[PDB]
Amino acid sequence: LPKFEKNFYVEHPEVARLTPYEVDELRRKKEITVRGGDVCPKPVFAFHHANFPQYVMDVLMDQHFTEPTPIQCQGFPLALSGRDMVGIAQTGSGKTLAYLLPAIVHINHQPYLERGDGPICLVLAPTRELAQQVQQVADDYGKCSRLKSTCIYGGAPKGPQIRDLERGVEICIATPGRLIDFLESGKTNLRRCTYLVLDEADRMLDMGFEPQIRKIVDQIRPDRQTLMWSATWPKEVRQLAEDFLRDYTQINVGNLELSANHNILQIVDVCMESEKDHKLIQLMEEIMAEKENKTIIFVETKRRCDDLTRRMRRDGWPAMCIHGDKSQPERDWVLNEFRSGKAPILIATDVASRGLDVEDVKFVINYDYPNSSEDYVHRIGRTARSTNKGTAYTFFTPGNLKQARELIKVLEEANQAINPKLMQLV
RNA sequence: ACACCU
Numbered sequence A: 001l002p003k004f005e006k007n008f009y010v011e012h013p014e015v016a017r018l019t020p021y022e023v024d025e026l027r028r029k030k031e032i033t034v035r036g037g038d039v040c041p042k043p044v045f046a047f048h049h050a051n052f053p054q055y056v057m058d059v060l061m062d063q064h065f066t067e068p069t070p071i072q073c074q075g076f077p078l079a080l081s082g083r084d085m086v087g088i089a090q091t092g093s094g095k096t097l098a099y100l101l102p103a104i105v106h107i108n109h110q111p112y113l114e115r116g117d118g119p120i121c122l123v124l125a126p127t128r129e130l131a132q133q134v135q136q137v138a139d140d141y142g143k144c145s146r147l148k149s150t151c152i153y154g155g156a157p158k159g160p161q162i163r164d165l166e167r168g169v170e171i172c173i174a175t176p177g178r179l180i181d182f183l184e185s186g187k188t189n190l191r192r193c194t195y196l197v198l199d200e201a202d203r204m205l206d207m208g209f210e211p212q213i214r215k216i217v218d219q220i221r222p223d224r225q226t227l228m229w230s231a232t233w234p235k236e237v238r239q240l241a242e243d244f245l246r247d248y249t250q251i252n253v254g255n256l257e258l259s260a261n262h263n264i265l266q267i268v269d270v271c272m273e274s275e276k277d278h279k280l281i282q283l284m285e286e287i288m289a290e291k292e293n294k295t296i297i298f299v300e301t302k303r304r305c306d307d308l309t310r311r312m313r314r315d316g317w318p319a320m321c322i323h324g325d326k327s328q329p330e331r332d333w334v335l336n337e338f339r340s341g342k343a344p345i346l347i348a349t350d351v352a353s354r355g356l357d358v359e360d361v362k363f364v365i366n367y368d369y370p371n372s373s374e375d376y377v378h379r380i381g382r383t384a385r386s387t388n389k390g391t392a393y394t395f396f397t398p399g400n401l402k403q404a405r406e407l408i409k410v411l412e413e414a415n416q417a418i419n420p421k422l423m424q425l426v
Numbered sequence B: 001a002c003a004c005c006u
């Protein structure tokens, strides 16, 4: 087993000199909470504290990044220290670079990939488009250290993915099913995997994904570092997560309860199911009169996604849809059209609810309320990325009554006005 | 339900 160098974080003197109270005040200013009893390095507060290669710093400055986000301030040094961790922070607040840039430093301290060598960093994600997005970010920065990456996911030909794995990648981004296929058939292996990331980790630990995660992680060396990330960390996944963690540290940004990004204006319209169509058209007529009008509309099922899109297109709306019954080339094409703005309206199932970072989305519409309050927080987080603001509009019916209590709590935490009809439902 | 190999 090639030796795993784990001790390479060098704390900057500007960070090391802070006293414990000063650290607590820095965390307070950034709304960082570290779970009690965990060992945790002091947070950094500038990119030059974070041990990054000069070429990574060059790329960061070229993209006009000036200061790490809160989850980066605490997550960079925790990840760099080699500790297992859980990092929870709001949608759009920079979790991807929080785990990718320490991955690059980690990789740079390991022996070079030989032949027959699988990846050093493995990132798991719940959807194919999110895996592709993370790989694009990783390539942007991994190229600085001459690192190779690939994306392993279903619906695309196996051959090119097998080629990339056999050529050698230090960084592999994957959805679980196709990776399991390749592990079972010997197209890659996890004997060099020492940095394992579960992005959208609470989703990856849910009823459908947890057995896939378990099958994968059972094949990885137990001396690996494991890093889990999400905007939501409900109690239900916390004990289960310990099956995949060893001596770990949990960090949070924002309130400890379930919380949305506070840059989102959250509007809830309480209505009957039969009123949704008319109300949607009214809303879209106002949205499409604006200059910045890029909109995602979420629905509950693939069938409703197809039906709503056809209904909208039949009336001349420039809408396209994405869901799991489309071919992967269709899914890729639609999302690229949405990113470019050639199609300003995307209608989607929860396939598009997590992780996707489309810069100029201004509106998220919950045509159907989702199955959980966590799903609501992720969906509305497709707007208000980075420092941007955005608006979410939700249609909430009496059929959704069971979800009302938790929705009210999310609205209250974000200091949003609560529709009296929603209150009257409880 | 929604994702997630074939």
Ligand SMILES: Nc1ncnc2c1ncn2[C@@H]1O[C@H](COP(=O)(O)OP(=O)(O)O)[C@@H](O)[C@H]1O
Pocket (backbone or CB within 6 Å): A065, A066, A067, A068, A069, A072, A089, A090, A091, A092, A093, A094, A095, A096, A097, A355, A356, A357, A385, A386
């Ligand atoms: N330190 C930073 N300053 C400004 N923008 C950033 C910074 N870090 C990341 N971003 C940008 O913020 C956006 C959201 O990042 P992302 O990693 O997708 O969020 P999350 O995973 O937390 O939902 C991305 O476009 C990313 O380039």
Ligand code: BEF
Pocket (backbone or CB within 6 Å): A089, A090, A091, A092, A093, A095, A230, A231, A354, A355, A356, A381
């Ligand atoms: F939480 Be980010 F939207 F992935």
Ligand SMILES: [Mg+2]
Pocket (backbone or CB within 6 Å): A095, A096, A199, A355
């Ligand atoms: Mg993310």
